[PDB]
């Protein structure tokens, strides 16, 4: 434009400092100290870990097949799912990794046995959610996108994420705790 | 007392928990084959990671 | 504790860095100054009559 | 949060009826094995939940 004449963002564009989206790579690079603690090794943590998409994309999926889209509605349901899915998960490989420290149990061993103990409540817990935030998967009143913005976040995901966390876990565990 | 998982009883609870103690085995040990042979399952990872 | 820690060498630097890192952190968002505000406040008024 | 509300109570309720079921013992003396297994257990979900 002629020289003399410049520019400036203002208000809603401005936004503001600061501000960056390096917050959940702290928060990822602190999820591993903490489980470093309850597992013992350094090795270990990946187990619960490598859960997170398991949870996500059907979170993904429910919203891209409903037509809606990222909110911030849709991303703390998704934070919930990161949490929930890996706090299962969290039971599982504690219970495996201590149902062969304190039974002293072979290579494999009740890995499987850790998902049969884990199995009844991980099924019961996700059934009461995605039952409870149904009517808010739909509901479709007052608030008719802001409710219904909040569930297809969760329902994708608790279907997603224990419907693979049963499979997927078990093999996290054994590929790495073998690994190293 | 030790062993009980109630498998059949009066109430329709007896229908289900044979139900679900039947469900349970079904598919408990299908890790089994899934865990022999991880790769088939360690790289359906990337193609949801992706 | 410290044979708790001893017991558990792995809290150990999971509470070390714990530290350091959201410590550390404090230093890329902390005022740098000389001195601590130690001066009295002052408002002065000013005029100016032509 | 009316879930990770609902999997704290529902993953200690149940994991004393399932070491009940399992060892026989009397209601409280598991509730404290089962315990005894899950109390580093809500120390990565109350430090990674946050």
């Given at each position: 434009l002629p020289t003399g004449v410049g520019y400036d963002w203002t208000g809603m564009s401005y936004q503001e400092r600061s501000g960056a989206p390096s917050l959940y790579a702290i928060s990822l690079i602190v999820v591993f100290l903490c489980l470093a603690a309850l597992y013992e090794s350094w090795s270990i943590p990946f187990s619960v870990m490598l859960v997170?998409?398991?949870?996500?994309?059907?979170?993904?999926?429910a919203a891209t097949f409903r037509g809606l889209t990222n909110?911030?509605?849709?991303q703390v349901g998704l934070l919930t799912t990161i949490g929930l899915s890996a706090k299962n998960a969290i039971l599982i490989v504690e219970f495996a990794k201590d149902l062969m420290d304190k039974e002293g149990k072979g290579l494999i061993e009740a890995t499987?046995?850790?998902?049969?103990?884990?199995?009844?409540?991980?099924?019961?817990?996700s059934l009461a959610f995605i039952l409870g935030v149904m009517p808010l998967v739909i509901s479709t009143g007052a608030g008719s996108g802001a409710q219904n913005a909040v569930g297809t976040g969760v329902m994708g995901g608790m279907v997603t994420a224990t419907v693979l966390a049963i499979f997927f876990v078990p093999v996290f565990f054994v590929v790495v705790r073998r690994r190293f | 007392?030790?062993?009980?998982?109630?498998?059949?009883?009066?109430?329709?609870?007896?229908?289900?928990?044979?139900?679900?103690?039947?469900?349970?085995?079904?598919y408990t040990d299908s890790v089994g084959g899934i865990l022999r042979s991880t790769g088939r399952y360690l790289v359906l990872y990337l193609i949801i990671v992706v | 504790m410290p044979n708790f820690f001893i017991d558990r060498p792995i809290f150990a630097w999971v509470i070390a860095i714990i530290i350091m890192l959201a410590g550390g952190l404090a230093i890329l968002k902390l005022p740098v100054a000389q001195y601590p505000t130690i001066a009295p406040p002052a408002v002065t008024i000013s005029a100016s009559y032509p | 949060?009316?879930?990770?509300?609902?999997?704290?109570?529902?993953?200690?309720?149940?994991?004393?009826?399932?070491?009940?079921?399992?060892?026989?013992?009397?209601?409280?003396?598991?509730?404290?094995?089962?315990?005894?297994?899950?109390?580093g257990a809500l120390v990565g979900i109350a430090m990674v939940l946050s």
């Open positions: 997170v998409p398991l949870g996500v994309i059907g979170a993904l999926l909110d911030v509605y849709f499987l046995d850790a998902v049969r103990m884990r199995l009844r409540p991980i099924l019961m817990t | 007392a030790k062993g009980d998982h109630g498998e059949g009883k009066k109430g329709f609870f007896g229908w289900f928990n044979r139900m679900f103690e039947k469900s349970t085995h079904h | - | 949060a009316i879930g990770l509300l609902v999997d704290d109570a529902i993953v200690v309720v149940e994991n004393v009826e399932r070491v009940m079921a399992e060892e026989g013992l009397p209601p409280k003396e598991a509730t404290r094995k089962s315990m005894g297994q899950i109390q």
